Design a protein around this ligand. Structure first.
Ligand SMILES: [Cl-]
Ligand SMILES: [Cl-]
Ligand SMILES: [Cl-]
Ligand SMILES: [Cl-]
Ligand code: NA
Ligand code: NA
Lengths: 243, 249, 240, 247
């Protein structure tokens, strides 16, 4: 199943879409500068692009938030004409965030919170569902089920690694196919950035994209360019072969 | 460090406290009947007892009943306290809930999945209430100190640390019995309690006895084990706890 | 199921047996020194005791087996050692009451068969990568090769990289699926990924009701065992 | 570091080499027939190929056939080499097997369960042959350097590291795609190959094999027109990856 995000087509048999941006919105000018760089690189390589940012470091020490965050996203969308993606944490956030942000993201540790699931679904926006670090990939079916029961089928599934002992993550490359097979071939994307815990990012990205995926998260010599050239070469090859 | 909870002393070298009750508040009379059975059995055996329930929580389907909700839940907690004279514990998900819940409930509980969330931590801290911190299944025991430090910074030192197992492959939990000691040593010997119900019956008994062997402040369980085998179960736990606690560290 | 080892009754509802000794036999005099201490401590505590040692990581099988014979003569206790080769099993088992399948060799069917054939009691070291519900597959093999006198020895489970964790639920899974054969707990291996830690882990494991405790390890052993004995005595006095 | 295995160049920046064949040797006829299929497919695609089989090993039942044994097994290997002109690989379990096996078999393989058995390591090293070290599922990739050091101390540096997956809770194996790089960085860029079969459906094996090979590896190891379609896909990805300069 493909999802149309403005003029972008996202699907497991389409050319991969890059999701990327900043960890957390600090200011308008630093956001616009970061987004400009991604746009420039993706444009010249011909890779579709969706800008990503959080308005919150929710876990940091006692060390811009919603209304100002949305203002910045509005400007990003005006200047560059691309879609954006952000995370939501509470039901009450969903409708106002969804008014501006094309894709809204369910954090992996909140995936069981059915009140947030309902509030997200109700917006009718495209939703990115991050897989919990503890969950079998065949269990993503059950979260997909909830969204469908809540009346939203515009769903993206997002790998971010699995718990591996204490304080470590491994990515099970078999999980991609399991999610595609059990969840009706919804777009599957790979959060490489959060899976890592640094040519390691490139190895990981390439291994994941070798399984035939809709897209990838990457965080930004011209390292981003160098990575994307290689990922695009691999993606183009894989997508040119019959499934 | 011990924590006083009304007349109860909670401490890693005190007689274990039972935190027990039900999953979600659904009905007043049913709550009172279940609580009555806990109270009756714990009184019979001389075990300190704190009644547990959730007023609002996610279930396995989007429309399964989440509980009576905050306003009716606190009314039910009030009736439990008035009838039985015992402390109660409940969880919260959002900062706005922290004050109204803390006014009524003796212990407030930070769900394991929210335990790294700063805004909720600060809001819970500022109630001044005793707080039960559930250890996320994806967190190492030496990292509990980071959560404790946030609470300390925000002015609240009355903290309990609650084990509920660690992710082990897919869809599975193991409880590291060494984690208890790591939490004691790294978090200033705050009370450590063991949620055997969510760490998973012959099983619950084995796992409870193993955990309590390491010398813990308390045991945390839900029933709907089977309610009637509670006395059998608690007899064995109290036996072990009394033996362990009666020997010097 | 209980197993008789000479005068000892080994079983999940009998008083726990200690397996303990030295890593590798280096000399006769040394062996007798370490063993005498274990015997002296355990005798006064009333804890049945089986002396454990390897004959090669040191002195080799020829010298090793003479040493073991001397231990048995002097002290009158059973002994336990690992075997690595099918040919070794018969000669070793003439002397050593219990013979041990190393964890790394657990899938080596020709050793299993050669061990079974001796009719000796066998200690099966559970690999850290084997689940407790798969131990029944090793037990199957020994049963088909005609030997049912098996002890299952827990050593911890792989937990991410390097680290080990002991699943306290695995003890019960092994009892239920392997016909309640004696289960013992190698607390030491489980740790080498310390005094206070070994005590907590040993107490926790023995709280699940086990046949024995297995150590790869001013009066630390005696004081450790007092505590373990107290727990065990309590647990074993409770109806199952 | 590359390794020359007759006319084959094995290394992390060379075209991938296929290792595969049969589980245990039974007869000359049976062996030649399976090996012929591998040879035909790999020759048709221009993929270097090393035939694999065991002469003697444990099975999943105590009375399953362990294989034809050392003497007849080596006779069969000799004939595979003469008939097809390819290198072969087999595992050894005992120091005393190492010399005669190494007389015939181009690569000798250290089973994962024996990875830390010093006396076998030494005996394997002393043959001077190319050695394949199977990485235990309970050993981390940074632990492989210790095995490598043993071999080096015993005088043999012609070593391949073979990934097989890692223990992941109960029963499951996961392959850490990051472990390949760790092994290359810590072990002097010795050839690393991927045993995709133990690591575990054709669909599944394909995904996993492609993922591993995307990290840039010396070879692919199978414990076993289907093989053709599979290899066509692996070669496509390998050729692409290998054709680009290392970043
Ligand atoms: Cl709870
Ligand atoms: Cl959790
Ligand atoms: Cl041992
Ligand atoms: Cl292995
Ligand atoms: Na030669
Ligand atoms: Na040679």
């Amino acid at each position: 199943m493909d999802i149309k995000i403005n003029d972008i087509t996202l699907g497991n048999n389409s050319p991969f879409v890059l999701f990327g941006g900043i960890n957390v919105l600090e200011s308008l000018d630093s956001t616009l500068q970061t987004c400009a760089h991604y746009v420039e690189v993706t444009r010249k390589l011909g890779i579709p692009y969706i800008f990503k940012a959080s308005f919150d470091k929710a876990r940091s020490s006692i060390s811009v938030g919603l209304e100002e965050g949305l203002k910045i996203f509005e400007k990003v969308k005006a200047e560059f004409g691309i879609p954006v993606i952000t995370d939501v944490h509470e039901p009450h956030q969903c409708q106002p965030v969804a008014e501006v942000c094309d894709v809204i993201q369910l954090p992996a540790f909140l995936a069981r919170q059915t009140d947030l699931v309902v509030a997200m679904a109700k917006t009718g926006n495209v939703v990115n569902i991050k897989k919990p670090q503890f969950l079998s990939p065949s269990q993503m079916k059950n979260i997909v089920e909830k969204f469908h029961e809540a009346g939203n089928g515009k769903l993206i599934l997002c790998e971010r690694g699995s718990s591996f002992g204490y304080d470590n993550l491994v990515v099970d490359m078999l999980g991609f196919g399991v999610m595609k097979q059990t969840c009706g071939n919804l777009p599957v994307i790979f959060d490489v950035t959060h899976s890592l815990q640094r040519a390691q990012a490139l190895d990981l990205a390439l291994a994941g994209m070798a399984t035939r995926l809709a897209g990838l998260f990457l965080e930004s010599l011209h390292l981003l360019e160098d990575f994307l050239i290689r990922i695009k070469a691999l993606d183009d090859l894989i997508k040119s072969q019959p499934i």
